[PDB]
RNA sequence: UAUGUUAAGUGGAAAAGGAUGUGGCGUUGCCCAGACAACUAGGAUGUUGGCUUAGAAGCAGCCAUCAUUUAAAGAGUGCGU
RNA sequence: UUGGCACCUCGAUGUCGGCUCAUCGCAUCCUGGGGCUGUAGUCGGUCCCAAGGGUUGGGCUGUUCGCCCAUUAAAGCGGUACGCGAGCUGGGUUCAGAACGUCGUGAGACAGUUCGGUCCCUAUCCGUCGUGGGCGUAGGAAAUUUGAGAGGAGCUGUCCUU
RNA sequence: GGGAUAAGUGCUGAAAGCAUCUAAGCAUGAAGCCCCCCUCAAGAUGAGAUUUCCCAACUUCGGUUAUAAGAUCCCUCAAAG
Ligand SMILES: CC[C@H]1OC(=O)[C@H](C)[C@@H](OC(=O)NCCCOCCC#Cc2ccc3c(=O)c(C(=O)O)cn(C)c3c2)[C@H](C)[C@@H](O[C@@H]2O[C@H](C)C[C@H](N(C)C)[C@H]2O)[C@](C)(OC)C[C@@H](C)C(=O)[C@H](C)[C@H]2NC(=O)O[C@@]21C
């Protein structure tokens with residue numbers, strides 16, 4: 001029903017009614033603007049696109065994503081908006097209620113909703129078999145030479161091959177993760193911040209896509 | 216964090232001066248326990264006399280572990296020694312002159328005779 | 338329900354029927370209900 | 375097939391509209407519309423209808439008698455009506471209505487509610503005898519089965535929703 | 550092409566055995582006097598008589614198992630202890 | 631499983647237990663649905679459908695196994711070169727030393743014990759886990775995307791109430 | 793929480809005027825199947841969809857410069873490695 005693009009600032013704690021330490025993740029949602037209203041007969045599925053943050057305007061000889069390029073200026077000027085930095089869309093919302101060009105405000109959420117925050121994880125880089133996959137590693141003594149490597153990767157002559165999905169070393173992080181059934185403790189309308197009980201995925205200064213639980 | 220092969224002091228005049236644990240009841244694969252959790256244990260030092268004697272297998276409930284426990288407000292209670300109290304399979308102690316403090320979390324586990332026969336609930 | 342490679346009437350009140358491919362016995366004694374065969 | 379050929383049917387103050395395959399019967403209590411077997415033909419004389427098998431194959435002898443009794447059930451049911459009676463035996467086992475639905479109290483720590491449907495009516499009697507009524511014999515049968523499946527009879531004290539006059543094999547388990 | 554067979558994907562892995570699956574060829578005992586169905590038509594008699602057995606009168610077991618009230622009838626074809 | 635056959639491998643196919651990692655069957659150990667019972671419900675027994683998931687920690691032996699002590703809802707049976715040593719150990723077994731019992735006149739011998747006894751290899755290809763570049767998608771681009779498919783989860787206890 | 797099922801339970805129902813879960817049809821029914829939930833996914837060579845941006849001027853005939861829109865080189869960096 002509701003959706004807002006925000007970014008993660010950090011974590012703190014709130015002493016709620018009945019003195020309970022509620023661990024919280026503060027999220028800064030500001031100038032969320034609808035840029036389109038997808039429709040079933042025009043695009044095949046009804047949804048709305050929200051742009052977050054604020055890039056600078058086009059300049060000739062730009063060398064960074066700080067400034068908008070001509071292609072993006074046009075997309076945002078059709079919604080009379082400023083070029084934005086992060087653009088996502090929401091399907092769960094009902095399109096008739098919204099309108100192209102409106103601001104999505106932190107106050108969309110009331111205290112005590114149930115939301116799903118979808119971000120991207122923090123990068124751990126190239127990581128071994130046991131940190132990436134939770135594997136028990138071998139003996140550290142008693143004359144062992146098998147400390148952290150993964151064990152057998154297969155059988156023998158039957159399946160003279162390694163099967164797909166064998167949990168081997170690679171790059172951890174950089175995965176979209178959706179924590180479910182979190183809730184908001186307070187919405188602040190002036191500093192533009194939605195506080196969410198628990199913890200959310202991602203580095204500090206990241207991007208979170210808060211919407212209403214699908215369960 | 217109390218696991219098997221952990222030696223605990225007894226906090227009763229039941230007859231056992233110090234005991235060690237074998238299992239932590241409560242689930243397949245359960246490995247650890249804290250205040251308010253029951254275990255199986257065999258005494259290793261008994262008083263001359265007492266109802267419980269050396270080498271017996273007994274139920275018991277943890278009180279005042281040194282890892283301690285978080286409370287819902289962000290308050291933590293820690294202690295300087297592990298300790299335990301023997302039970303009679305009805306959440307009831309054996310001695311009646313329990314020594315040392317006891318946490319307030321034993322109230323919930325309905326170990327009320329343990330909380331009533333205690334120097335300090337905390 | 339007995340499932341045996343030999344469905345045969347056990348009582349005189351026993352009727353062999355063929356339902357859904359399988360030769361069964363349906364009787365008023367629930368003990369004599371049988372299935373395969 | 376004796377059922378089929380021999381036994382001729384008897385339309386009684388009803389209107390059996392044999393429109394090709396799809397028949398219709400309408401009378402005092404309502405209208406029933408079924409689609410009967412293709413190969414079969416029908417000969418309706420005055421106040422009588424006769425079904426005819428095109429051959430004598432096992433195939434055209436079994437279908438024959440089947441949908442000769444499925445017409446009778448329609449005409450006999452659109453004129454006389456079909457009703458099934460269910461009893462409820464047991465201390466505290468009751469039966470009460472709720473307006474187009476029936477609530478059952480059969481010792482289930484929860485009330486069970488059977489909602490009614492088109493062309494089907496329900497009623498109770500002395501809070502024990504439920505009665506399902508309607509024009510289709512296969513709706514009165516379907517519903518009455520649904521209302522006995524709530525708690526079918528048990529073998530020790532007979533407690534449960536039993537069809538009126540249904541032998542409940544009673545075992546004699548002892549304390 | 551002609552004439553038939555299967556309904557299981559049989560064809561396109563087993564067997565003793567089990568079966569109102571279906572096709573063929575005989576043989577047959579019954580049937581318009583009207584066999585076979587549930588044909589909702591009667592169902593019991595002196596009489597369990599005798600051994601009557603835990604008393605038990607279609608069950609813990611020898612059956613001595615007589616004629617029919619009768620269109621049709623058995624000291625009960627039979628479900629029972 | 632114990633075997634029988636001697637068909638590939640003696641210009642070498644490392645053999646037993648344990649560790650790491652599993653994967654598959656179902657004749658199912660638990661959990662779900664049922665027919666039953668010499669099932670009153672809890673109880674158990676039997677058979678059927680079911681393989682989605684789950685299916686402990688220790689003492690003793692090199693042990694697999696088995697017994698025992700505590701638990702658990704359960705502590706399943708098998709295949710995979712009795713899965714897996716170019717992933718690990720090397721306790722057992724199978725070299726040279728030694729010793730006891732036995733056999734041999736003797737050198738020596740025993741699948742009889744016992745103490746000790748070197749586990750090499752920088753990955754070419756297929757395979758697998760990640761991560762780039764090229765090109766194609768009838769113009770060149772920036773962003774948002776539906777989902778053909780594919781993968782992951784999938785367990786369950788106790789208490790209270792009725 | 794849907795949808796289709798397994799053993800099973802039925803409803804109406806004849807072959808076989810009776811019966812009967814079955815043959816037509818039509819019900820219900822499991823941690824199982826499908827969807828539902830999380831993630832990857834148009835190299836899905838079938839290469840999909842939506843919005844926007846760029847748009848001339850020599851040819852002697854494009855097998856054409858260089859430029860748009862857009863990027864990169866290079867350099868300061870890390871929420872990434
Ligand atoms: C360091 C690099 C060198 O590697 C090696 O030494 C490794 C360690 C060696 O691994 C093994 O020991 N077995 C694995 C351990 C198995 O223990 C069980 C307990 C035992 C025993 C035993 C039995 C009999 C005798 C024996 O009777 C006797 C005598 O003298 O009579 C001498 N003792 C010592 C015996 C001891 C290689 C790899 C070895 O191969 C393997 O041996 C097996 C016989 C067969 C294996 N397969 C074919 C199944 C084979 O793979 C060789 C033979 O080396 C001795 C390798 C050959 C090629 C070499 O010579 C190279 C050049 C090595 N020489 C050197 O300098 O570099 C080396 C690479």
Ligand SMILES: [Mg+2]
Pocket residue numbers: none
């Ligand atoms: Mg060779």
